[PDB]
């Protein structure tokens, strides 16, 4: 009974947050593109510094 209660407690949260995978997917795609640009900018900054 207690395990079932805990499972039914978590499950709606699981359903609630499952849909966010795709919004998260584009989020990380954009974030990692941003990080690539940041790494490129840092590399080029150091490149010129000398």
């Amino acid at each position: 009974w207690q395990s079932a209660r805990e499972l039914l407690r978590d499950w709606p949260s699981q359903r609630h947050l499952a849909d966010r995978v795709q919004p998260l997917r584009m989020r990380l795609s954009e974030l990692e593109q941003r990080l690539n640009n940041q790494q490129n900018a840092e590399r080029l900054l150091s490149e010129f510094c000398k």
Binding site: Q14, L31, L35
Partner: protein, 49 residues
Amino acid sequence: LIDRVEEVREEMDEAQEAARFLQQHGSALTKLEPMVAVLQSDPQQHEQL
């Protein structure tokens, strides 16, 4: 230096695991949710009750 991509990736791991569990046991949980109360009453425990 946000470095949140790691955090977002952890969120994806958790959320995709949640979706996989939904696929794995969605029907079972749906069948359990309307008659959960029975788990509190075990046949012999009904007599002891």
